[PDB]
């Protein structure tokens, strides 16, 4: 009921991390283009096989003088995987501890970014080369206020364009251009890639890259489909620059979650030149890349620890929108006060000081195991509370009882995603 909002609201305001005026509003008026980079982990950035770079385009962005790149950014997903990361981008709220929030909470009342942005006249659309029913997206996007859903009905699903879950990234990005250029501006858009999906085979000759030689074909083929993903982003960027949308936009790209689980530890230790992959090393491998190119704004390679729930306020702040009145779990990464103790969905966490995995603590810098006696419990408490506040919102559908100042309530029945 209405009184349970109070405790959550008092904590969200008691922790809000205010905006950096070096950055706040500096991208006001711009389009937003999100790209979800399927199963892409940060270890891939700058990685080479036989002296050949695996992700040369993404590497250039990582090394340029203009793009924000975050090398200590972590996925915070659970069992809803791709859609768990989408939920966090739009809501700055954690997904469910078990099962999928997209599948089970699509009737919650939400106050998403695409919905916030309506009062600034943003049209919102998702692009994805698979049916709209996948991960219950067609129900959940309506709750999120997404105006348009360009699913697989809008792509040529032939022989050579289709792999496993649907469209390959290269033709998916080509075909999305006229659809994207038809959008009244300003627009807020999501591109959900498909091609870098487990077990990571790619067809010859859709890419020319060698497979690694690590004794495991899942891991061997990862590098080939990652290289293909990288060419797709390059083409997308070239096309964004032909049509003039590159200078009119904030492009935000993120790996959605890990692609390589602990079932492949034997090969991953070879990938890393290590004897074995420990619990600690695996925690380090949950880094996913985050890139933000905000046109008109000089980006920095930022090393602050951050997670998925931090993206939405970073972006909103860049657009000049004040997030103090919203119930959001995340903290603007560009903020001076930005918190760096990063929860994982299962209650583990990572921070510059500590990595905590199944109740063990390690020194984040060195991997050295720490005994419980010498650990400051204050970080663990911050984590529990951060997760708890979010869970109260989602479990009690608390946003029915909260009205932020700008916000006009979303009516899911407004949206229709049938292709005519
Ligand atoms: Mg995924």
UniProtKB/Swiss-Prot annotation:
Residue spans, topological domain Extracellular: 1-420
Places the protein is found: Secreted
Binding site residues for substrate: 197
Positions annotated as active site in the UniProt record: 82
Positions with a binding annotation for Mn(2+): 38, 82, 256-257
Name used for this protein in its record: Processed glycerol phosphate lipoteichoic acid synthase 2
Lineage of the species this protein comes from: Bacteria, Bacillati, Bacillota, Bacilli, Bacillales
